[PDB]
């Protein structure tokens, strides 16, 4: 039941459906380069932040972007169009009132046109064979937090920091090959260390927490720790590049 | 939008082709269309043997979405009417229940509520394998749960009540309660399971308890005496009024009555 | 007018060409699907092939 956790079993099985390729920059994309994905990813994140989108819109949109770039080569000039379309669909999948085509085009400085976004929506959805209900890191974070015996005050902060970490991963090339379970696990344990603002005071110790998550998502402890270390490293990079 | 049906001689693959048009002239594809179809696509990642599998989803540029489904010919009604004159044997009924419950537990586990299970919706291959269909894409009240008859909230327990009705129908081979309207079908149920007490009644609801006379629960062997003692208990746990005390599909698969004895 | 996120990332777009490509990519699929099931979905009614289509 709760001891078997049949839901966690289904989630790990479902997250093998919508997985992009580790190496589509060499194999599929001619004009697009890994540096260009960080650019459009950064733009897409800023858009979801201004429009106060739901948490998962941006990481889900990045999921769609990678899967499409794993299937069809995309011109440099049409990469932004692809990303605006991914936000469009992701907004529909997780937001009550989704982003309008009119606003996304404005966010491309009126580079793309609404009818083009709508037609790119059909190309996107059909290339993904309508496989749009992808497991999100959010789905796993919520499941992990339901097993953590922590004050709701504490969970809300762990949740916010984890969600932040998830966004940063979705901009880094290194994390395309990570399934949402792994990105969520790393985000959680990195969040419970608390940005080093003070010492951790957790009713479930960090040791037991990592070994629990490692057993649950079926990886060796040293492997999840390296993921935590990548995310915190990615945090250091995010902050250094923000200040220029 | 004419439903089509084709069999593949090279593998016996049987398909049906449903087509639905959607408006979509402003904000592209509608939210419900893109959510409902994606939910169907998520299910087939598991390829569950007790639910019809969806093959492809073809869209057309004023938008037509065409779903290619797995198609089986017999439904449960046809299978039941074709039973041996004495009826289905026990081990066959148990096997059909098990697969039925497995499929329903798969749907519930993926937050899908059938909400309209009837022997016409339950489909049986020629090899004796049942597959559930008609769900997650958007009358007779003989199978609707009492919380639905009262316009109250649904949740997944609505399907477990329907299972109870179909469970007993496989023995009776005539349906359990056949009422003419919501109020009266509710009455025929209480003539079997008894009028529920005071605090077991839902609050915000369409008919008060005073709409129904005092009535005690008559035995379950009154209705299905073709059925063993343990199977009678299992039926009642499905025909339980309160949806929060009603048995789940997973718990039913663990009941001793459905335990395959070899 | 425009917030800081409003920004063209990678130069201009040839709109007349893009719409030509968008339908070509899209009808490459509508035909590929029509080939997989020998059932023209745009005109919605069968062809002849591996799947012998019937009706209701």
UniProtKB/Swiss-Prot annotation, chain A:
Superkingdom of the organism of origin: Eukaryota
Biological-process GO terms, alphabetical: cell division; DNA damage response; endoplasmic reticulum unfolded protein response; fat cell differentiation; G1/S transition of mitotic cell cycle; lactation; Leydig cell differentiation; liver regeneration
Keyword Coiled coil: no
Residue pairs linked by disulfide bridges in the UniProt entry: none
Gene Ontology molecular function: cyclin-dependent protein serine/threonine kinase activator activity; cyclin-dependent protein serine/threonine kinase regulator activity; enzyme binding; histone deacetylase binding; proline-rich region binding; protein kinase activity; protein kinase binding; protein serine/threonine kinase activator activity
UniProt keyword Transcription, yes or no: yes
Range of residues in the leader sequence: none
UniProtKB keywords: Cell cycle, Cell division, Chromosomal rearrangement, Cyclin, Cytoplasm, DNA damage, Isopeptide bond, Membrane, Nucleus, Phosphoprotein, Proto-oncogene, Repressor, Transcription, Transcription regulation, Ubl conjugation
Cyclin N-terminal domain span: 8-132
GO cellular component, one term: nucleoplasm
Broad class of where this protein is predominantly found: nucleus
Post-translational modification: It also plays an essential role for recognition by the FBXO31 component of SCF (SKP1-cullin-F-box) protein ligase complex following DNA damage. The DCX(AMBRA1) complex represents the major regulator of CCND1 stability during the G1/S transition. Also ubiquitinated by the SCF(FBXO4) and Cul7-RING(FBXW8) ubiquitin-protein ligase complexes. Following DNA damage it is ubiquitinated by the SCF(FBXO31) protein ligase complex.
Subcellular location: Nucleus; Cytoplasm; Nucleus membrane
UniProt family annotation: Belongs to the cyclin family. Cyclin D subfamily.
The protein's name: G1/S-specific cyclin-D1
UniProt organism field: Homo sapiens (Human)
UniProtKB/Swiss-Prot annotation, chain B:
Primary enzyme class: transferase
PTM notes: Phosphorylated, in vitro, at this site by CCNH-CDK7, but, in vivo, appears to be phosphorylated by a proline-directed kinase. In the cyclin D-CDK4-CDKN1B complex, this phosphorylation and consequent CDK4 enzyme activity, is dependent on the tyrosine phosphorylation state of CDKN1B.
Annotated consequence of substituting residue 24 to S: In CMM3; sporadic
Species of the source: Homo sapiens (Human)
Function of the molecule: Ser/Thr-kinase component of cyclin D-CDK4 (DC) complexes that phosphorylate and inhibit members of the retinoblastoma (RB) protein family including RB1 and regulate the cell-cycle during G(1)/S transition. Phosphorylation of RB1 allows dissociation of the transcription factor E2F from the RB/E2F complexes and the subsequent transcription of E2F target genes which are responsible for the progression through the G(1) phase. Hypophosphorylates RB1 in early G(1) phase. Cyclin D-CDK4 complexes are major integrators of various mitogenenic and antimitogenic signals.
Presence of keyword Ribonucleoprotein: no
Stored InterPro entries: CDK, Kinase-like_dom_sf, Prot_kinase_dom, Protein_kinase_ATP_BS, Ser/Thr_kinase_AS
Cellular compartments per GO CC: bicellular tight junction; chromatin; cyclin D1-CDK4 complex; cyclin D2-CDK4 complex; cyclin D3-CDK4 complex; cyclin-dependent protein kinase holoenzyme complex; cytoplasm; cytosol
Taxonomic lineage of the native organism: Eukaryota, Metazoa, Chordata, Craniata, Vertebrata
Active site feature: 116
Disease: Melanoma, cutaneous malignant 3: A malignant neoplasm of melanocytes, arising de novo or from a pre-existing benign nevus, which occurs most often in the skin but may also involve other sites.
Family per record: Belongs to the protein kinase superfamily. CMGC Ser/Thr protein kinase family. CDC2/CDKX subfamily.
Region feature Required for binding D-type cyclins, mapped onto this chain: 30-36
Compartments, as annotated in UniProt: Cytoplasm; Nucleus; Nucleus membrane
Any one GO molecular-function label of the UniProt entry: cyclin binding
All residue ranges annotated as the Protein kinase domain in the record: 1-258
Signal peptide bounds: none
The name this protein goes by in its record: Cyclin-dependent kinase 4
Gene that produces this protein: CDK4
Swiss-Prot record, chain C:
Tissue: Expressed in kidney (at protein level). Expressed in all tissues tested. Highest levels in skeletal muscle, lowest in liver and kidney.
Gene Ontology CC terms: centrosome; ciliary basal body; cilium; Cul4A-RING E3 ubiquitin ligase complex; cytoplasm; cytosol; endosome; nucleoplasm
Region (Interaction with CDK2) location: 28-56
Other comments on record: Decreased levels of p27Kip1, mainly due to proteasomal degradation, are found in various epithelial tumors originating from lung, breast, colon, ovary, esophagus, thyroid and prostate.
Domain remark text: A peptide sequence containing only AA 28-79 retains substantial Kip1 cyclin A/CDK2 inhibitory activity.
Protein family: Belongs to the CDI family.
Annotated protein name in UniProt: Cyclin-dependent kinase inhibitor 1B
Organism listed in the record: Homo sapiens
Encoding gene (name): CDKN1B
